[PDB]
Amino acid sequence: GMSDLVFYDVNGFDPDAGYMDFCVKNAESLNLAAVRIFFLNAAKAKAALSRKPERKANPKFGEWQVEVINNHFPGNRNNPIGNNDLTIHRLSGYLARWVLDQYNENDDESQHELIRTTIINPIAESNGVGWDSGPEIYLSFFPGTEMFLETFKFYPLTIGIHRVKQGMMDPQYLKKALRQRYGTLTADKWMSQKVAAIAKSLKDVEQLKWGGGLSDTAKTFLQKFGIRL
DSSP, X not given: OTTTTOOOXXXXXXXXXXXXXXXXXXXXXXXXXXXXXXXXXXXXXXXXXXXXXXXXEOOEETTEEOOEEXXXXXXXXXXOOOTTOOOHHHHHHHHHHHHHHHHHHOOOHHHHHHHHXXXXXXXXXXXXXXXGGOHHHHHTTSTTGGGGTTTTTTHHHHHHHHHHHTTXXXXXXXXXXXXXXXXXXXXXXXXXXXXXXXXXXHHHHHTSOOOOOOOHHHHHHHHTTTOOO
């Protein structure tokens, strides 16, 4: 695959092969502005697709246009999804990984500041979690990141485990993450072999500041005392 650079002759959905295909087709036309717009508008895009009868559609986010399968219109819910096809959910996962790749591309502080100020994760932010928590953990609040459990250091799973433990989520919602691979390991194999790694990941999640900042009224008050925020 993409990590060991081993290639094969041309079965089930493999998110690593899906990500490769996505990158071949889209890497050149992606930019941070477009990806920011995507993440701010993913849910709205699903809503919009839900009243469009066409089996495929071509939403545009900023300057970047992309073809997706429309599984949101009720008449289309059954239609098969191809391994190289894009859905809003798959795109969310692929773009979260693309943002991480951008972050890891170099360690200049300007790169990190650009990414931290441009990409917003509304789900993370709604929970009191910002970029300061770490890039993998921040990005793991995005839908679709469960496709890449090793990449995201088990956080797409352990966020869900934490939520269940806190009574914030029905255990059934864990089913998606629990079906995924971890690198080369199948779910049966990592559930058996990676308990320590997952526990370590969960502790990272438990230590997040689940909650937020000072109010506008408080900030205005504090400015009267020469405190600018």
